Amino acid sequence: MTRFDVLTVGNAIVDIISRCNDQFLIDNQITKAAMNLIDAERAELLYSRMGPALEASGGSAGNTAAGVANLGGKAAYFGNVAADQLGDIFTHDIRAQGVHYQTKPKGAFPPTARSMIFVTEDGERSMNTYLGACVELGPEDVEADVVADAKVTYFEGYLWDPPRAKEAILDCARIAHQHGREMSMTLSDSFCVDRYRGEFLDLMRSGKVDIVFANRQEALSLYQTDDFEEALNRIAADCKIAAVTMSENGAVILKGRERYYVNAIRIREVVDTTGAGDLFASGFLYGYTQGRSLEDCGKLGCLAAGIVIQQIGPRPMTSLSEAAKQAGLI
Amino acid sequence: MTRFDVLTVGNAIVDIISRCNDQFLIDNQITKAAMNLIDAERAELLYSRMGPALEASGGSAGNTAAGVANLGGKAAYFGNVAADQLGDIFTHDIRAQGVHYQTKPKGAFPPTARSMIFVTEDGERSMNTYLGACVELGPEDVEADVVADAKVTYFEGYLWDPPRAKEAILDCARIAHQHGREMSMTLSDSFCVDRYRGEFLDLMRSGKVDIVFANRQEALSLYQTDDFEEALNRIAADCKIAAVTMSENGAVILKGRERYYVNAIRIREVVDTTGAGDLFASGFLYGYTQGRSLEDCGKLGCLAAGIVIQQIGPRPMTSLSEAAKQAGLI
Numbered sequence: 165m166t167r168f169d170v171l172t173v174g175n176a177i178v179d180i181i182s183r184c185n186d187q188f189l190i191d192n193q194i195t196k197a198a199m200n201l202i203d204a205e206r207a208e209l210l211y212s213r214m215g216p217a218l219e220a221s222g223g224s225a226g227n228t229a230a231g232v233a234n235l236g237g238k239a240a241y242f243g244n245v246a247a248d249q250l251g252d253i254f255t256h257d258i259r260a261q262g263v264h265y266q267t268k269p270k271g272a273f274p275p276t277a278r279s280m281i282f283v284t285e286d287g288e289r290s291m292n293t294y295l296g297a298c299v300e301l302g303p304e305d306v307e308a309d310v311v312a313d314a315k316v317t318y319f320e321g322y323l324w325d326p327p328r329a330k331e332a333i334l335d336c337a338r339i340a341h342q343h344g345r346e347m348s349m350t351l352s353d354s355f356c357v358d359r360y361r362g363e364f365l366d367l368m369r370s371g372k373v374d375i376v377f378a379n380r381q382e383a384l385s386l387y388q389t390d391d392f393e394e395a396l397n398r399i400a401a402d403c404k405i406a407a408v409t410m411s412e413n414g415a416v417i418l419k420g421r422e423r424y425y426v427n428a429i430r431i432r433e434v435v436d437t438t439g440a441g442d443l444f445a446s447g448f449l450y451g452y453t454q455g456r457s458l459e460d461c462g463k464l465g466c467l468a469a470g471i472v473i474q475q476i477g478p479r480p481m482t483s484l485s486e487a488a489k490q491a492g493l494i
Numbered sequence: 495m496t497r498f499d500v501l502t503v504g505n506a507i508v509d510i511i512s513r514c515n516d517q518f519l520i521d522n523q524i525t526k527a528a529m530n531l532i533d534a535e536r537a538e539l540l541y542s543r544m545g546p547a548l549e550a551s552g553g554s555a556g557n558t559a560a561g562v563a564n565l566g567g568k569a570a571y572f573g574n575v576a577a578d579q580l581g582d583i584f585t586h587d588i589r590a591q592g593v594h595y596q597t598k599p600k601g602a603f604p605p606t607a608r609s610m611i612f613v614t615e616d617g618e619r620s621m622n623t624y625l626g627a628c629v630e631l632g633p634e635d636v637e638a639d640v641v642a643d644a645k646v647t648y649f650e651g652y653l654w655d656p657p658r659a660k661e662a663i664l665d666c667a668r669i670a671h672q673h674g675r676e677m678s679m680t681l682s683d684s685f686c687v688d689r690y691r692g693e694f695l696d697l698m699r700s701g702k703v704d705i706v707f708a709n710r711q712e713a714l715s716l717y718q719t720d721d722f723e724e725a726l727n728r729i730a731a732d733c734k735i736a737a738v739t740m741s742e743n744g745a746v747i748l749k750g751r752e753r754y755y756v757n758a759i760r761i762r763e764v765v766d767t768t769g770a771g772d773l774f775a776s777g778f779l780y781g782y783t784q785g786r787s788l789e790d791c792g793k794l795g796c797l798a799a800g801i802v803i804q805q806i807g808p809r810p811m812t813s814l815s816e817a818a819k820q821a822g823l824i
């Protein structure tokens with residue numbers, strides 16, 4: 165009997181969300197559909213140009229933990245905020261969803277990370293992230309008893325950007341595996357992959373990462389190929405289990421020579437794609453820690469992903485567990 | 495020609511929004527559909543029990559100014575925040591809508607006001623407001639040049655709660671009337687009216703308030719009657735122009751013996767009633783300052799109101815001016 169099903173580790177972020185036209189992206193040299201890192205000066209500049217906005221707790225892994233909790237699984241989260249109002253919001257939202265969150269702020273500066281997310285008419289999201297207090301996450305924030313007591317520890321590729329987070333993750337890897345648990349990562353973003361390609365591959369090939377999440381872009385980038393079939397064969401060879409999403413075309417789960425294809429739910433309208441990948445991981449990891457088939461994990465992933473893209477905000481405001489019961493996924 | 499069509503004055507507040515069941519209201523002794531004032535200790539308590547939330551810039555008058563700006567009118571706002579992150583959010587959202595907002599924060603403490611708004615399945619909103627830095631708004635925040643140059647200065651009844659706001663308002667009344675402009679107020683909330691009945695009536699009868707906004711509940715409370723026909727006759731006798739909203743039953747505008755009845759627009763679904771009255775006033779005051787007839791002012795009000803209640807958040811995220819152009823109201 166174990167304390168947690170899923171522990172996630174990520175950049176703790178509050179989203180600042182606004183709708184824009186595509187000319188806004190071009191005028192501001194914002195790479196569309198991507199995570200764009202920005203300094204404090206650029207953050208002020210972009211905000212000055214941003215329309216009236218809504219705020220909502222974010223962070224890829226934070227969203228994923230929240231999604232596991234919503235579904236009914238037992239979640240935990242590691243991520244550093246500042247001792248400020250944005251930090252208080254982040255802390256409230258994740259804890260109120262029923263996720264264990266005990267990471268202590270280190271001070272007020274740097275302030276709590278934020279991401280200005282611009283949503284275009286097509287529902288695509290373009291993120292502009294000032295990492296703030298995220299740069300302070302290190303080994304000192306690893307709650308060893310939590311990693312030891314979690315079926316899966318899952319982390320973002322995004323953590324390779326701040327300086328010392330990777331050290332926390334290696335510490336996590338070691339504790340998890342010594343306790344016979346498994347480690348999971350998402351590739352996060354195609355440019356993030358570009359930046360850390362060798363390191364990500366090393367994590368997979370050394371056995372420090374057991375299950376890998378990727379979308380089509382991330383997979384294509386990982387192997388710098390335009391051949392998706394090549395990407396699928398290579399990713400299968402590089403990790404024990406790979407879950408590869410393909411947006412409206414659904415997902416394929418890979419294990420050794422096994423492939424399991426899952427359909428995407430049919431959408432009324434794409435509101436905002438923010439959190440689709442995160443919530444796919446929520447459903448997959450919930451199913452996975454409940455002992456479900458790799459196909460059923462895929463199904464749960466697509467269900468959670470499908471729900472999150474039909475609302476504003478990265479964390480489902482409706483009941484995932486209820487949705488899963490209605491869908492016969494239970 | 496003048497710089498401003500509408501100046502509004504109010505409690506500068508950021509909303510913290512969550513959906514709840516009706517048992518939540520009962521267990522926490524929250525008065526349904528009402529503005530519930532709370533201290534710092536109660537705010538912490540309620541937040542600790544609140545679910546994952548979304549933040550959005552609020553304040554009744556704030557929403558109203560932003561709504562006038564959305565429709566194409568020239569707006570200005572007086573309201574006091576603190577020098578903190580919530581205050582920076584408030585300052586951003588109202589300015590980015592093209593509202594003149596120059597009220598200077600006095601420090602970091604008390605912090606920026608916030609209201610925890612719980613939305614029930616029926617779409618009703620129950621607000622729980624800590625006034626924070628709002629208690630510091632006073633005559634010193636009256637930008638005399640703005641009042642002098644605004645066609646209408648509009649204020650909340652809610653302003654009678656903080657200690658010195660009423661002094662700013664009397665200064666606005668004097669300046670507005672001496673420059674040949676009009677003063678407007680909203681009765682805000684039925685319990686607010688209970689609290690300040692004598693003072694509100696005196697504002698109306700002395701000529702400091704020319705145009706009054708009320709919903710059915712507020713009108714009945716103003717005269718402590720369950721006879722709505724009595725309320726309409728009495729309100730028409732106490733102010734020059736009365737705009738009385740009746741939710742799904744639309745509105746009635748009253749001027750002397752004239753009555754102009756307006757229908758509510760067709761609604762897909764009542765998502766969240768937060769801002770309905772605020773945006774009615776936006777539509778009304780936009781028409782009014784554009785020389786439109788009282789009936790067409792009603793119509794523009796009902797349109798702006800009808801749009802706001804079909805979304806989460808108190809400020810329409812879509813173009814009101816475009817909606818009005820499509821609506822044949824121009």
Ligand SMILES: Nc1ncnc2c1ncn2[C@@H]1O[C@H](CO)[C@@H](O)[C@H]1O
Nearest residue numbers: 175177222223224279293322439478
């Ligand atoms: N650098 C980053 N690291 C982790 N998460 C991020 C980063 N930038 C944006 N996000 C989060 O990604 C989520 C969508 O997947 C958003 O909620 C946003 O907060």
Ligand SMILES: Nc1ncnc2c1ncn2[C@@H]1O[C@H](CO)[C@@H](O)[C@H]1O
Nearest residue numbers: 505507552553554609623652769808
């Ligand atoms: N005491 C108050 N004074 C002014 N506005 C308020 C108060 N409490 C809540 N509000 C605002 O009322 C709006 C809905 O009319 C919400 O956006 C909320 O911010």
Ligand SMILES: CCOC(=O)c1ccc(N)c(N)c1
Nearest residue numbers: 533534537538603604605624
């Ligand atoms: C409900 C939020 O309020 C506070 O935390 C708070 C209020 C007043 C103060 N002076 C301080 N320091 C904090």
Ligand SMILES: [K+]
Nearest residue numbers: 436472475477
């Ligand atoms: K979304």
Ligand SMILES: [K+]
Nearest residue numbers: 766802805807
């Ligand atoms: K609303």
